[PDB]
CSV table of C-alpha atoms in Angstrom, one decimal:
chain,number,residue,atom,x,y,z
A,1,UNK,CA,-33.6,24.9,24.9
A,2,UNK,CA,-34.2,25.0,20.9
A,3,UNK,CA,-32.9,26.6,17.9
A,4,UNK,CA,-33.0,26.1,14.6
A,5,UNK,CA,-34.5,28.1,11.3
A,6,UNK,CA,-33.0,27.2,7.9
A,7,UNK,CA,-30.1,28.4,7.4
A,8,UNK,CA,-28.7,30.2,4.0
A,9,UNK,CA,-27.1,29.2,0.6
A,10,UNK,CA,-25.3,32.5,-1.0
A,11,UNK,CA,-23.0,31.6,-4.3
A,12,UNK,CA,-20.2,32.9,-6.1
A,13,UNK,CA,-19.9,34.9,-8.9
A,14,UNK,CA,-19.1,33.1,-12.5
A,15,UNK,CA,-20.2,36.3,-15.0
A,16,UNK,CA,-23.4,35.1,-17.0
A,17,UNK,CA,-23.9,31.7,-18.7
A,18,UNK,CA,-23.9,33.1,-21.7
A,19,UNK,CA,-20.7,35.4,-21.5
A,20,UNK,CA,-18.8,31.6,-20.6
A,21,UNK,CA,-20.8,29.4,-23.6
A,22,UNK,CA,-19.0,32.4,-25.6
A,23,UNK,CA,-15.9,30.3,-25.9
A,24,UNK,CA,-16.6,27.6,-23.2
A,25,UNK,CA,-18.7,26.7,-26.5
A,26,UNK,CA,-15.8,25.5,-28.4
A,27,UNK,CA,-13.2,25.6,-25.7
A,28,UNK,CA,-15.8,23.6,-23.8
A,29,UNK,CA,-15.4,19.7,-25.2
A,30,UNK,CA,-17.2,17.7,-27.9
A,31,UNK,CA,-20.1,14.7,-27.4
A,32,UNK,CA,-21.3,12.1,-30.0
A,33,UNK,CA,-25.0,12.0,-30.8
A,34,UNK,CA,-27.0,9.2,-31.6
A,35,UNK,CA,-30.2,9.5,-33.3
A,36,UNK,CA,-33.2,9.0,-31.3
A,37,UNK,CA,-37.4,10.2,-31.2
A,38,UNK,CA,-36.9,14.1,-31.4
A,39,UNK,CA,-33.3,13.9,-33.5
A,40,UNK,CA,-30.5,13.0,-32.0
A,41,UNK,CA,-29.5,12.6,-28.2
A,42,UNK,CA,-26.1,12.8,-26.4
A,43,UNK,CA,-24.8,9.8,-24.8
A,44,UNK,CA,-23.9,9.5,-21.2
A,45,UNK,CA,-20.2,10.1,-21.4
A,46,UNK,CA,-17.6,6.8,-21.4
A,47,UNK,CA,-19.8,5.2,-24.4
A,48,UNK,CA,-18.3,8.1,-26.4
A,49,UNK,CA,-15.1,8.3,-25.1
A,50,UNK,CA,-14.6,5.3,-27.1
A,51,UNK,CA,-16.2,6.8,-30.6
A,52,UNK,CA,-13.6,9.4,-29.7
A,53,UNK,CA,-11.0,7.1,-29.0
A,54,UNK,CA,-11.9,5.1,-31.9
A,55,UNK,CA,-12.4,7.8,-34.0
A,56,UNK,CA,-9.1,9.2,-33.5
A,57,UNK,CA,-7.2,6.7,-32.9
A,58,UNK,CA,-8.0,5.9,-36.2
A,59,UNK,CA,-10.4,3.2,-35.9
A,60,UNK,CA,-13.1,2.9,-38.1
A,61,UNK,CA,-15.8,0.6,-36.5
A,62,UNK,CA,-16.2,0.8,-32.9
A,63,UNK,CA,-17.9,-2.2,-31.2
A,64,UNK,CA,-19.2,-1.3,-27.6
A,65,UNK,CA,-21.6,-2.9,-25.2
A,66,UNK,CA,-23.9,-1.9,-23.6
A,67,UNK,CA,-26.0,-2.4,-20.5
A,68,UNK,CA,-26.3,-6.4,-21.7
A,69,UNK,CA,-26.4,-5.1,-25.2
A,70,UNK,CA,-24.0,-6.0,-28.3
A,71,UNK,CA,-23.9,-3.1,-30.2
A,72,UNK,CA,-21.3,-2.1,-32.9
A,73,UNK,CA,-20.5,2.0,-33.7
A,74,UNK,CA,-19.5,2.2,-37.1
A,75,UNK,CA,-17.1,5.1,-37.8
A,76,UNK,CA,-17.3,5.2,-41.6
A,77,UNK,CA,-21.1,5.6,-41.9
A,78,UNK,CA,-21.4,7.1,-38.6
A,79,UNK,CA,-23.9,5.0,-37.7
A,80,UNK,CA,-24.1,2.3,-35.1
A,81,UNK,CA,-26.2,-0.9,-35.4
A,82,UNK,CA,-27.0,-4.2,-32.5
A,83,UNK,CA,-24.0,-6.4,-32.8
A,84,UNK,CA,-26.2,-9.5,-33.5
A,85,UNK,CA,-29.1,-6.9,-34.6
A,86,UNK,CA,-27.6,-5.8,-37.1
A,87,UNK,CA,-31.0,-4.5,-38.7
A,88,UNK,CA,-31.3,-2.0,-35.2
A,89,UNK,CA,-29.3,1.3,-36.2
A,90,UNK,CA,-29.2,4.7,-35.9
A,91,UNK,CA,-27.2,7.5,-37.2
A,92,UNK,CA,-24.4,9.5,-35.0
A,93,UNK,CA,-23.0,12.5,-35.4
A,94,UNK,CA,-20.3,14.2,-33.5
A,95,UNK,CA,-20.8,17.7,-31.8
A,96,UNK,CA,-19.7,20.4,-29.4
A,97,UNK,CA,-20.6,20.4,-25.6
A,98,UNK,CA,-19.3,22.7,-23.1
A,99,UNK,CA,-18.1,20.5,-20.3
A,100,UNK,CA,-15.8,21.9,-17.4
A,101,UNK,CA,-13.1,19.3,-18.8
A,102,UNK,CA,-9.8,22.1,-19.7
A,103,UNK,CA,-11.2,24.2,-16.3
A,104,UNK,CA,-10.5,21.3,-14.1
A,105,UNK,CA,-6.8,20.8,-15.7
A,106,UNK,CA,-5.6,17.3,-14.8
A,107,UNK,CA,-2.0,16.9,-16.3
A,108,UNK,CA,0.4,14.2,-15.8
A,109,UNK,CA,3.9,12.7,-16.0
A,110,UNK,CA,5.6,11.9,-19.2
């Protein structure tokens, strides 16, 4: 014989996505913007881990590259511009994002 319809999906309950942004705002995580066509966009993720890095390390000017692309963050402007395109810049601009970074708790040995 045969079976078969679909089957279901169901899902938990989190409280509204609104009630979380509340503090998962802040106590979310932070992103670095680069300008772009409408303003300013957020970068994938690693990019700015090193403007972070950087940034707090103490670093002023970040070089990074890209997918076969020089390009050089620069910290004191906040700006970034091509390594040997040094004319090709934009602005950046660090801001909050709400990513499940402290939720998923990932400690380790000192």
């Amino acid at each position: 014989p045969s079976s078969g319809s679909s089957g279901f999906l169901d899902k938990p309950t989190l409280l509204s996505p609104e009630e979380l942004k509340a503090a998962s705002r802040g106590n979310g995580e932070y992103a670095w913007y680069y300008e772009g066509r409408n303003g300013w966009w957020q970068y994938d993720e690693r990019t700015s881990r090193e403007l972070e890095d950087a940034f707090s390390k103490g670093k002023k000017n970040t070089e990074m590259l890209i997918a076969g692309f020089l390009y050089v963050a620069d910290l004191e402007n906040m700006v970034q511009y091509r390594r040997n395109e040094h004319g090709r810049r934009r602005k950046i601009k660090r801001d909050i994002i709400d990513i499940p970074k402290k939720g998923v708790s990932g400690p380790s040995s000192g």
